[PDB]
């Protein structure tokens, strides 16, 4: 029964009994001290990090022996513990052992209550220290001077002294022996607390207890990192080297068995002072708490809020995960406990200073924002870590911006381009692993409540990662310096929009050296922006006032304009993801909803980077202003995370991966039509590449969004359709008659996914005329594909005329773009014909 | 104590148990066989002999310490996981040779994905591609 | 008084035997802060100074430090840790960027010297930079105000 109090002060002075996290240890360690004296040194060491909770565990032992003094019938006596971090810098050991030993006896014989008993037994004490205080100048010399060859041949001790040299190691011994016989025990516990502070000073100590206790009478426990004394072991056989032989013998041939010879020497030497037998680890959190299902060692709670009972304590797994569910926007699975079991492996004084820091900011605010809770404590306890990796430290900072920047950063250390956007606390590094969740709670914290930031870290911060991966960075110290003009083109953490970065992302993946001159690029296609001869079908120059109002509107913030050495225009995907951040943004105003309208398309001037060597429009805004209503009445119970975003993030890449080589042969003469899924005109790259987000946010969303607790997509393959839309369709279908199954609705299940599929901007782009397939089957599932797509949104997208005219080849249409298919692509000379 | 089939110099017996009669006490090599063959899973072939040999090798007080910790934490134990209490006793004492290698010297860390990495560390300091993984002591170098 | 205190300006080492003079609350003038203050023992030599000389504030003038910028170490360090009162006005002459190159050696030396060797790599030399910059821009923010700055004009600009 193990109850962490979080609200108590929890420090080694005031953690007693029945909140000591090693207990078993602290049991089988006093067994283990009082056995080696009922039966030369006798030393025990307890490992641990730093950390661990050295200085708490062997007071306790401490503790542990002093109670019951006479009933057990071995008797030890304990001295108070030595700290050599806090003893003054020149003041030796064997004094300071003396001393507390001195006091101990002292105190013992004021005690007794026979006069000759007591006066006998003192001058005996003070012989032993008057012998101690003539030989201690042994150890603080210099050099050796003559008259201490007199004082060494005095055998008038009055003791035994079997050798007779003025052995300091031997004087000890009596006085250890006599103050046993005063004290009335069998053994005297010297105990020694961690290093870790400055281990400098744990050197005297090692020397003290094997030049100097090596008495029977005598039992050490000390605290501390092996690894921490290794080195400093090491560090002092390095000195007994003549420095001369250091620099004349460089050669590796001498210089591998000299690093050698150090080696062997300090595997004795921890070896001779610390038997392993006698060894003792302690266990971390993780290793006492066990795994997922598998019981643990001990079972230890917690209490998160005060004026609590022990029965209303949750076990300590519970209670990180919570922080960590709730956090960081995390449901229960394989990728919540990873995020605690990381932080279960961290130091105990690491793992309170976040569970307190948590809980104490939690209960003074529910007497919210979760989120925010967690960040706060994971933003000083992984403070270090943030230095050392080079991130972001001004709280007063802490936006949009500076996040889209950490993540660049932390991913260019991290050395994981591919999937190192998701924060995993997987890296080998520990500072890089300690910010995998610090950052991991800023994306779960920023990105709360919100749509238009969700994206946001969707295609700028994920996004930045992954354009550079495949685009950049093969140019690549050259590297640090690609960087320092990659980050300063794309503006990574000082943006001004969404679609301001897909204007200059979408100058990257054309920057590229990409062979074939194929204008379909990744997440993009290169319109013509002029016409020739030799033009054939009903295939012309692209026009932008040909559509309607809604069509020309969503169209026109997909359009991005390079300034290359000739002007370029470029509808891409990104665009309409970089519109709807922006939009999204803009409050219920008509009055500035233009401005996101028309920022996007004019006054966009975007010259290559250094490393590129080279009213229908008011029938719109209505339903623009009716979603940005409903976004404000969902997107505050949205709750997504890193994990998330990266997982949406990660399917939308891969398939801007097939759509981009998929379709880029795939054009030929009579792919005007595009009634056969053959044909992939441009109305149809496109068309996939919005049905591509949408069911990003579908899959993923599906399995990850914090609101649901039982899947919805279910067991199948998930192949993220290119060229196809029936697994899309199905997805959807399957989760109409899931949510029917349980009475539940489509809004609170994925708030995330309603939001984007009722978009005005994206209804134009799912229906294009060069779009929809148009065999048997192709229509037999589109036909219930746009039925479904209604039903969830609310409200018909396309009429009974609307859609028969698309599936059999004038009405014009606002909600439908129309020559985005008789626009031809960069590159593409149509000289060959559709195969049947 | 020979190699197994030679009449050694000496015959040093080891007493594994408290109390346990001088008459009846197993030889050294077998005290060191059964830890090694019960714990790292081998049957009677040349890979124990070999890894009992190295052991034999190893300092005198390198040695008692493998054999002191192993044998008192099993007795205690029984009143298993034989591997798991060698890997106890092991760790110990090669436990300078870790910091010299760069293995996983932390018992919280001893992730399934660590070990991947100590081998792959360790067959990339064993500097030998097609037999390092077999995880034999056919180095030059003691760590 | 002033006289009594001077060891510690000159001092290189604490003699425990001095703590016993600086626990002494003898003096009538009454300092607030604890014994053994040359910043406020000066402050009050000061405000007895303008007493006497009739005066509402001292005026300390100091020349500038070309042929030797290792001298005005003690220049700064004087005027803001015993210079900082309303009875003084302080004016200082001298390049500004050799005060800079001044202080900026002395914000590395406060740096360990086993540190700046076993760190080298660009990340944490960068870092250092930064906060050197940082540190000695704040140096002289604070003992030189800007808006007290005066600049003096070359041929050129009169
Ligand atoms: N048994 C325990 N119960 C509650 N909290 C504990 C316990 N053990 C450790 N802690 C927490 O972990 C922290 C670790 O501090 P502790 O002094 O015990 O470890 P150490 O780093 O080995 O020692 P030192 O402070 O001497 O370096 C404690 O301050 C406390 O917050």
């Given at each position: 029964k193990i109850i962490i109090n979080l609200f108590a002060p929890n420090l080694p002075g005031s953690t007693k009994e029945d909140d000591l996290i090693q207990k078993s240890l602290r049991d089988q360690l006093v067994e283990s001290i009082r056995n080696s004296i009922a039966y030369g040194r006798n030393v025990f060491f307890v490992d641990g990090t730093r950390g661990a909770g050295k200085t708490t565990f062997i007071n306790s032992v401490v503790k542990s022996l002093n109670s019951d003094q006479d009933d057990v019938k071995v008797n030890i006596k304990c001295l108070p513990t030595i700290d050599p971090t806090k003893l003054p810098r020149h003041e030796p050991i064997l004094v300071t052992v003396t001393a507390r030993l001195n006091k101990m006896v002292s105190d013992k014989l004021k005690g007794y209550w026979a006069s000759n008993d007591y006066r006998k037994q003192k001058e005996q004490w003070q012989n032993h220290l008057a012998q101690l205080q003539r030989g201690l100048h042994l150890l603080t010399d210099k050099e050796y001077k003559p008259e201490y060859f007199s004082d060494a041949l005095?055998?008038?001790?009055?003791?035994?002294?079997?050798?007779?040299?003025?052995d300091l190691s031997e004087i000890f011994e009596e006085l250890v022996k006599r103050a046993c016989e005063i004290l009335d025990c069998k053994a005297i516990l010297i105990t020694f607390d961690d290093i870790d502070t400055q281990f400098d000073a744990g050197w005297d100590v090692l020397e003290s207890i094997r030049k100097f206790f090596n008495s029977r009478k005598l039992v050490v426990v000390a605290t501390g990192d092996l690894r921490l004394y290794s080195q400093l072991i090491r560090g002092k056989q390095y000195e007994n080297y003549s420095k001369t032989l250091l620099e004349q013998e460089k050669e590796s041939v001498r210089l591998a068995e000299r690093g050698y010879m150090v080696e062997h020497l300090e595997q004795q030497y921890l070896l001779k002072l610390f038997p392993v037998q006698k060894r003792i680890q302690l266990k971390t959190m993780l290793q006492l708490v066990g795994e997922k299902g598998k019981a643990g060692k001990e079972e230890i709670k917690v209490k998160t809020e005060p004026g609590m009972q022990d029965i209303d304590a949750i076990d300590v797994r519970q209670a990180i995960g919570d922080a960590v569910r709730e956090g960081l926007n995390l449901r229960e699975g394989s990728d919540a406990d990873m995020y605690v079991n990381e932080l279960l492996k961290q130091p105990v004084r690491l793992l309170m200073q976040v569970l307190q820091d948590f809980y104490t900011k939690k209960y003074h605010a529910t007497s919210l924002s979760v989120p925010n809770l967690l960040r706060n404590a994971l933003y000083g306890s992984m403070l270090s870590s943030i230095y050392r990796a080079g991130l972001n430290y001004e709280q007063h900072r802490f936006g949009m911006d500076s996040l889209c920047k950490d993540i660049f950063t932390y991913v260019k250390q991290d050395r994981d381009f591919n999937t190192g956007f998701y924060l995993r606390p997987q890296s080998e590094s520990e500072a890089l692993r300690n910010c995998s969740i610090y950052l991991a709670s800023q994306v779960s914290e920023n990105c709360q409540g919100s749509l238009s930031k969700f994206l946001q870290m969707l295609l700028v911060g994920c996004g930045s990662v992954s354009i550079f991966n495949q685009f950049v960075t093969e140019l690549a110290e050259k590297f640090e310096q690609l960087i320092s003009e990659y980050v300063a083109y794309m503006s990574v953490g000082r943006i001004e929009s969404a679609s301001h970065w897909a204007n200059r992302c979408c100058a990257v993946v054309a920057n590229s050296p990409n062979d074939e001159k194929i204008g379909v690029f990744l997440g993009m296609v290169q319109l013509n922006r002029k016409s020739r001869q030799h033009?054939?079908?009903?295939?012309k120059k692209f026009n932008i006032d040909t559509e309607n109002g809604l069509a020309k509107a969503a169209m026109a913030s997909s359009l991005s304009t390079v300034a290359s050495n000739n002007l370029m225009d470029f509808c891409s995907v990104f665009n309409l993801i970089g519109a709807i951040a922006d939009i999204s943004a803009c409050r219920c105003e008509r009055s500035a909803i233009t401005n996101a309208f028309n920022k996007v398309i004019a006054q966009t001037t975007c010259i290559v980077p250094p490393w590129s060597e080279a009213t229908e429009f008011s029938d719109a805004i209505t339903k623009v202003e009716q979603w940005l209503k409903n976004v404000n009445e969902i997107e505050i119970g949205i709750r997504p995370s890193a994990l998330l975003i990266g997982k949406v993030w990660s399917r939308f890449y891969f398939n801007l991966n097939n759509v981009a080589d998929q379709h880029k042969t795939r054009l030929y003469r009579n792919a005007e039509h595009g009634r056969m899924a053959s044909q992939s005109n441009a109305a149809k790259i496109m068309r996939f590449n919005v049905l591509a987000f949408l069911h990003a946010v579908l899959v993923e969303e599906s399995l990850?969004?914090?609101?649901?607790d039982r899947e919805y997509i279910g067991e199948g393959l998930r192949l993220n359709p290119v060229t196809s839309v029936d697994e899309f369709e199905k997805k959807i279908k399957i989760i109409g008659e899931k949510l029917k199954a349980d009475n539940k609705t489509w809004k609170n299940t994925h708030p995330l996914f309603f939001l984007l599929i009722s978009c005005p901007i994206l209804h134009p782009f799912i229906f294009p005329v060069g779009g929809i397939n148009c065999s048997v089957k192709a229509l037999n599932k589109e036909t219930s594909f746009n039925k479904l797509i209604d039903e969830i949104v609310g409200d018909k997208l396309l009429s009974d005329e609307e859609w028969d005219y698309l599936t059999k080849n004038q009405q014009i249409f606002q909600n439908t773009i129309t020559s985005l298919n008789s626009s031809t692509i960069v590159g593409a000379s149509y000289d060959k014909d559709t195969p049947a």
């Open positions: 005095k055998l008038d001790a009055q003791l035994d002294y079997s050798i007779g040299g003025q033009m054939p079908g009903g295939y990850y969004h914090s609101v649901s």
